[PDB]
């Protein structure tokens, strides 16, 4: 069981800079359509929720990419959950 | 007879934050499918209704978990029903 | 029947300083999520409407708090309705 | 046969300010549930349609209330149909 | 002969809030199965019909309960028929 | 003379939940074939009739089981007949 | 006597996710026709009923498969019956 | 036995972009009606299910087309099943 | 010879709203049993046929009631046959 | 034989705005019940089908009215079929 | 011996779009009654079965029409059987 | 076969200025209702899709008008597809 799959209920309520963490994954994991659909929600918590709805088709390449981007953007949050 | 099973007709007309009380139960009690099916109703009273249709396969672990989450989200609602 | 519950059709069309009456209620009655969700409407009449959708889970503590904040912000409006 | 019951096919294609004419009827004719259900349609013509589905249980008090509110909101439309 | 048993042909064409009048009877008169079977019809007039098919096993407790809930939900319909 | 053997003309005109009272008796009193044959009638009064056609080979075990299941499903009907 | 053959009256009133437990058995035990026929019932308790009507041609391979799928989908229900 | 016909139980729980894989097949294999009927389900897992109900009249052209489109949309999923 | 008794082969091929013309006759002419039996046919032409099988025990009250209800529901068909 | 009765197989595959062509016919030809039943189909081609099942009791007023409404909504379709 | 009369057991297990192949035959070969009766089955394989029960009164016009419509809707199935 | 009807899968993923190509077609081909319904989608790819659902009732006048407006708005895209 991966790191993101266990604390999923914790992250969806605290990540703020949705746009800059959405940017880095554009070229590899997801196509154009999935990038566009996220703009429909128009609230910080809801958007992230929709993203985790696509966790059904992630394998280790894609989950590991997500953990990579989330460690590069915030060195205080990922640290804070990993300590527990 | 448990607390939730007797006053069931009272809660389905008053619970507001459907999403945040659905969030906490994801990882343990129910699978992904039951989590997705609830989005179909698209009205605050109806959604909760569908959830109580699954009370057929709950035992004390699950009823006690739900009572726990409802005590954590509203410290005024559960209080108000427990007084009566 | 409380004061706010009777003239509800009167208030939603005249309250101007939505932000400063939303501020005082933050710490006690409602959580973070309901505070954020109100930003979706983006019009003075619509926003207040959404707030009154949550009156289903208010008891005397919360209704009385709202009456309190509305008396502190506008000493001309609440008086004007109370005279009639 | 009342005024609203005869020209029903005419009104459902022209009424614009659905929200403010729905507001005035809240306290007397319909309960909370019917007030909430109308938000499901999300199109100006469809919503009013659903409202007329409740004409089955209106009597003269309620039809007269509806004609009253529709005369108070638009002094050009109700006049325009009554002339014919 | 009870009130519900004589004007049965009048009610099946006018009751709108099927769901909220079905809710109140859940705990005492009927079991879970009859509560679920009503969802099969999926039209306002048809559903109520099926309910009256169970009038064969009602005695005064159950007829009186139904009359009670229908007086509590609509104070205009029961009034309007009782006057005649 | 047993309870069911005397009011045989009374029950066949009032029992509604045929399926759930047929269910409980499956494992002990009757075999699979008689369970299947009852589906041929396709009417609430007729089906029950067919069941009583097997009263020729019941002894106290089976009649007592039937009275048991019918008291468990309807606590209002069996009471209502036993009072008289 | 197998596990499913004794507590059959217990399962038909509690299994909720009919579709996802019907899925796993598709490839080996039953053909396409029996898979399609189950859609006719359109109620959670009834559908499951029809499945057990095919228990006439099951041997240990098929009963063991069904017990397998029901243990994989719900680790709380099969446990709760196995304890008694 | 083809690739899609063996791992059918694997795909129906993981395919995300239903719309864009439905789009490419329009012009050749299926008519307009089958394209329209898929909108009824309104849930990610259910929709795809209905599509596989038409596998009765596919031959190598049509199955091969489906494998082609599913390889073009997700270069990570089809890989992941083909490795095993 | 009455009106309905002469054109018996004409009506059984054209009456559509069987249910709403069956409703009006419930309270006086026919009992509950005959009302329930009609649901067995499940086709518009066949149902009416069964009703005319009971013309053996009709007198003028009941035939006149039937002609009354069919004139009240359809003002175009009864006219069209009466002209000829 | 009327225009609508001959080309019936052509229209049922092309009429799009079911709602606005259903609106105009409400007041004269059909009652409320038939107006409500049409919402059950929930697909553009199927709905029209059900409507044509009622052509059994139409005379020249009703068929001619339908041809009128269909000429008022689409001045391009009725023209296109009438040319042939 | 015609084509349809030889592969009768082959077609009844593979034809999917029952409705659109039933549509084209309406105007010439069969009347309204047989067109309505097919709706009773409510399963894809069974419906077609009933159709072939009318093969007792087909001559070359009607068999040739059915083969025509079945070649027009599916250009892959008729091909696949004709090759063998 | 027209130009738009063959490369329809190409256009639905690239057209940007929905509003200005919807404007020019207002007065002739489609009525007010179809113009209003398109606002429901609220995503650039989805909207155009809905428009192509009305291709069932276009003839050469309307398809030719659509091709005209799309050639007038973008002199780079229509050229780009016509070259292939």
Numbering used by the authors:
A (entry chain K), B (entry chain A), C (entry chain L), D (entry chain D), E (entry chain C), F (entry chain B), ...: 1379 to 1462
List sentences quoted exactly from the publication behind this structure:
Many NLR proteins nucleate the “inflammasome”—a large macromolecular complex that triggers inflammatory cell death and cytokine secretion in response to microbial or danger-associated ligands. Like many other supramolecular assemblies in the human innate immune system, the inflammasome complex relies on homotypic and heterotypic interactions between the death domains (DDs) to initiate, amplify, and propagate pyroptotic signaling. Inflammasome sensor NLRs can be grouped into two categories based on their DDs: PYRIN domain (PYD) and caspase activation and recruitment domain (CARD), both domains were found to form filamentous complexes to initiate the inflammasome formation. Extending this analysis, we also found that specific type II interface motifs directly dictate the compatibility of heterotypic pairwise CARD-CARD interactions among NLRP1, CARD8, NLRC4, ASC, and CASP1.
To test this, we solved the structures of recombinant NLRP1-CARD and CARD8-CARD filaments using cryo-EM, both at 3.7 Å with Gold standard FSC = 0.143, without masking. NLRP1-CARD filaments are relatively flexible and adopt multiple helical organizations in vitro, as evidenced by heterogeneous 2D and 3D classes observed during structural analysis using RELION 3.0. Trimming of the last eight a.a. (1466–1473) helped stabilize the homogenous form of NLRP1-CARD single filament. This conformation was subsequently verified to be a signaling-competent confirmation based on functional experiments using 293T-ASC-GFP cells (see below). Importantly, the resolved CARD filament density fits snugly into the lower resolution model of NLRP1-FIINDUPA-CARD filament based on negative stain EM, matching the shape and dimensions of the inner layer almost perfectly. NLRP1-CARD filaments demonstrate a balanced charge distribution on its axial surface, similar to previously published DD complexes. In the NLRP1-CARD complex, two positively charged histidine residues (His1454 and His1452) extend from the Type IIb surface and interact with negatively charged residues, Asp1437 and Ser1435 on the Type IIa surface. In other words, NLRP1-CARD uses the HPH motif on its Type IIb surface to preferentially engage ASC-CARD and disfavor CASP1-CARD. Thus, NLRP1 requires endogenous ASC for inflammasome activation in human cells, whereas CARD8 can directly activate caspase-1 independently of ASC.
